[PDB]
Design a protein around this ligand. Structure first.
Ligand SMILES: O[C@@H]1[C@@H](O)[C@H](O[C@@H]2CO[C@@H](O)[C@H](O)[C@H]2O)OC[C@H]1O
Ligand SMILES: O[C@@H]1[C@@H](O)[C@H](O[C@@H]2CO[C@@H](O)[C@H](O)[C@H]2O)OC[C@H]1O
Ligand SMILES: O[C@@H]1[C@@H](O)[C@H](O[C@@H]2CO[C@@H](O)[C@H](O)[C@H]2O)OC[C@H]1O
Ligand SMILES: O[C@@H]1[C@@H](O)[C@H](O[C@@H]2CO[C@@H](O)[C@H](O)[C@H]2O)OC[C@H]1O
Ligand SMILES: O[C@@H]1[C@@H](O)[C@H](O[C@@H]2CO[C@@H](O)[C@H](O)[C@H]2O)OC[C@H]1O
Ligand SMILES: O[C@@H]1[C@@H](O)[C@H](O)OC[C@H]1O
Ligand SMILES: O[C@@H]1[C@@H](O)[C@H](O)OC[C@H]1O
Ligand SMILES: O[C@@H]1[C@@H](O)[C@H](O)OC[C@H]1O
Ligand SMILES: O[C@@H]1[C@@H](O)[C@H](O)OC[C@H]1O
Lengths: 436, 436
């Protein structure tokens, strides 16, 4: 299996999940994508403190079970999120402190895990317990104020409530190894494992953006925590701008770590994202697969037999043996591309960008004017439109994000001058290409 | 004078307008921009057929007058749009055909022009009467079916109704001289002039996109029509992607033809556009100027006597002599840029794209991780965010679209290694940059 993210991940014993919003389970466009692509589910909000215990001692597992049931019935495991957190607590808990609060925490953990006992693969017992000031220490919350040992207490309680569930510590900004926050969490987990504190995994939310960008050392971070004897999981992945290279990089980081259980992206479509403005997911609002989607799938499936091109290269048709060429090195918008004998020349040098464009001359983009069969493929000023974004299938076909159609050599032409158009993908040789 | 589009355009004896939507005049941010930048107004829908004559014989100018009143109150002239058209006809007119339709057409023209008699600078008497099948013939509508002479009849009627108004024939896809449609309208206009049919102008909608891309021959198209003895006007300008170069090219084409009266963009902010999806206007949804706005303004002001860096190039600050440099030529996202001795290296080669980005390495973008003062300017994967878009002002300053702040060398730094940040513009030497 390797046509969907979930199946591709399963090949290596891993999973590819998402965050499910109970309210969207009635939207077939939403559920059609979610049920097909993912084999792990996290309730976006339905299993949080305020949602499961609106009143102390008064547990409401309605919305939560709705998500749990849908997940299991559709062949997905579940990550419980989350049991002890300073954020999203019921109004009553936000007022508690010291001994009373500590007690409420314990009770809550027992209540939720009791109800779900033996059904949850991973539980984010404690979430975001460290600050971002740079000190590398605990953030000041009513929870921390109950004593520095709360985290440890939460995990012991957790193990007790349900020993079959993997207990994780979940946080954000602990992906970059050089960051103090990261080191603070690292030391704690090292401490816990040495003292025998029950903790089985560390969740790296992985919310990357210009404020806190992804860094290649992320893999080093995972390997380090892995060496401590705890599993690692990418829990809430979303990348501002959904760069193909970054998504693929995070994917390979997990595949490179034997203890990395899997990857979960925080949402289905960009429009479902808590940060839609950053279009940080793998699917467009119209449900179409984004450039990064294919980048992730290809990574999960084992990459290419030959190391991919590094900016600026040729694209020759398999059936013709000729290259994607812009007639007479023209640079005027609207010029339809053709096939031509391969040779070193700017008008045959295409660069695949992280945004999914196929650039030429530096600021011109492979462009599709329309979404139907026969649409001419031309060059046009780059502007980021979905009709200028393409997915590089591992089978050699290049699919337009917006149209869902393949680059096609008209009438299966192989001669110089054959024009390129969009057409239903057919696996024909006039729809397959190799990049250098 | 030269700070706003209207005032700049006025320095060449031309106007710069927009399309106003009555339902948006209650939006303060919209009116603030609209009132400041344009001196010519077109009702986006309020003066159309269905809006001005709901039932046959019953005129209604409430919606049209709201726009008109606002236009005059803010010192703008008005273009009446539109009197005879196959589209947006009220249902009672859609039902008409033959001589009944012909007289209805005439009756509509007299009623609307009568109401606005002496108040309209230009009237789009007839709109989109030519086919779009690429043959250059008449569009098949109930109007055309009343007889080939309907257009002529509309103009003669219009002249008599308000002799003070300039009578225009408006249409789209008539910008590229090679298109059959463009030639068909030319032939018609030429025929009207030779036979004495009253027509004073031809409006070129200029709705450019990858399906109907702007072409440099547009200038000849304008010249050709101008030669027939009529004025020309870019009436509904918007460019898919809003390329800075294309917006500048169109502007220069109009300024190159003495008979080109002015330029009207079809909307204020991209969010106000009938095609927001193509982010085709000059202003963002938050009201900030796009890189294309600056390009248009600079062109209106005559541009620079020194050609911009055609692909690649360095950026050197005046009060620093140093060139924008990426530390150790790194390629890691989040790397704050600095100033340094201008050497021949790629980590100093910045390309200003038509989308407004400052790219280095081919696919890395000058990025702003915030909007406030002090925000560190770094490089990040290009994805199109406004925090990656920049405007190159004529005063040598580079201001961030999203932030509205200027690139600034920390504490007036000038020595190698000075970090770059975002700070309120100040004409300070540590905020002016030169490029060659
Ligand atoms: O609620 C939390 C956010 O406040 C948090 O914000 C992060 C702060 O550090 C910045 O560098 C990040 O870019 C920004 O996302 O993110 C996690 C969320 O749970
Ligand atoms: O719908 C929103 C959720 O998507 C959001 O989820 C949180 C995002 O930041 C992460 O650090 C947290 O772990 C995660 O739960 O919470 C707010 C809710 O309104
Ligand atoms: O170049 C285009 C061909 O690639 C295209 O091929 C069709 C693909 O779908 C199959 O079911 C058809 O049998 C096959 O001909 O045909 C159109 C042509 O322009
Ligand atoms: O209603 C009109 C549209 O039908 C028209 O559509 C254009 C047709 O030619 C294509 O090449 C263009 O891309 C497409 O926009 O555009 C103008 C609009 O008023
Ligand atoms: O709000 C929309 C208007 O912006 C739109 O305006 C028309 C666009 O196509 C041009 O060819 C026409 O001349 C112009 O009036 O009309 C539809 C309306 O919903
Ligand atoms: O320690 C971290 C520091 O290295 C980074 O630059 O900014 C965030 C801090 O938490
Ligand atoms: O684009 C083609 C060019 O690359 C080749 O060299 O000569 C023929 C052109 O059509
Ligand atoms: O980035 C700088 C590099 O471009 C220069 O050559 O040497 C000093 C570095 O800091
Ligand atoms: O360089 C900055 C200067 O331009 C501004 O005026 O004041 C703050 C400084 O950091």
């Amino acid at each position: 299996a390797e046509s969907t993210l979930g199946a591709a991940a399963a090949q290596s014993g891993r999973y590819f999940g998402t965050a499910i919003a109970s309210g969207k389970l009635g939207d077939s466009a939403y559920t059609t994508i979610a049920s097909r692509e993912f084999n792990m589910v996290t309730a976006e909000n339905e299993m949080k403190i305020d949602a499961t215990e609106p009143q102390r001692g008064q547990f409401n597992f309605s919305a939560g079970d709705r998500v749990y049931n849908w997940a299991v019935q559709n062949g997905k495991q579940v990550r419980g999120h989350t049991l002890a957190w300073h954020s999203q607590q019921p109004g009553w808990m936000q007022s508690l402190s010291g001994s009373t609060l500590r007690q409420a925490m314990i009770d809550h953990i027992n209540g939720v895990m009791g109800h779900y006992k033996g059904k949850i693969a991973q539980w984010d017992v404690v979430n975001e317990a460290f600050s971002d000031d740079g000190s590398g220490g605990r953030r000041d919350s009513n929870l921390q104020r109950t004593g520095n040992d709360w985290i440890e207490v939460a995990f012991r309680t957790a193990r007790a409530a349900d020993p079959a569930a993997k207990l994780c510590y979940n946080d954000y900004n602990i992906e970059n190894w050089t960051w103090a926050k990261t080191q603070g969490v690292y030391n704690m987990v090292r401490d816990f494992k040495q003292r025998g504190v029950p903790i089985d995994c560390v969740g790296f939310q992985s919310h990357f953006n210009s404020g806190s960008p992804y860094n290649s050392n992320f893999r080093t971070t995972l390997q380090n925590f892995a060496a401590l004897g705890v599993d690692v999981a990418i829990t809430e992945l979303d990348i501002q701008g959904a760069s193909s290279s970054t998504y693929a990089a995070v994917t390979n980081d997990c595949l490179a770590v034997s203890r990395c259980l899997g990857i979960t992206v925080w949402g289905v479509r960009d429009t479902d994202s808590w940060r839609s403005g950053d279009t940080p997911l793998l699917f467009n609002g119209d449900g179409s697969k984004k450039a990064a989607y294919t980048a992730v799938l290809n990574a999960l499936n084992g990459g290419s037999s030959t190391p991919p091109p590094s900016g600026g290269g040729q694209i020759k048709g398999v059936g013709s043996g000729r290259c994607l060429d812009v007639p007479n090195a023209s640079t005027t918008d609207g010029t339809q591309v053709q096939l031509y004998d391969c040779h070193s020349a700017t008008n045959q040098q295409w660069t695949y960008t992280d945004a999914g464009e196929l650039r030429v001359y530096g600021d011109k983009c492979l462009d599709a004017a329309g979404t139907g069969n026969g649409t001419k493929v031309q060059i046009y000023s780059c502007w980021g439109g979905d009709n200028q974004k393409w997915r590089l299938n591992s089978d050699g076909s290049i699919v337009g994000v917006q149209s869902g159609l393949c680059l096609d050599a008209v009438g299966g032409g192989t001669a110089n001058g054959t024009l390129i158009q969009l057409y239903s993908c057919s696996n024909g040789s006039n729809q397959r290409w190799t990049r250098t």
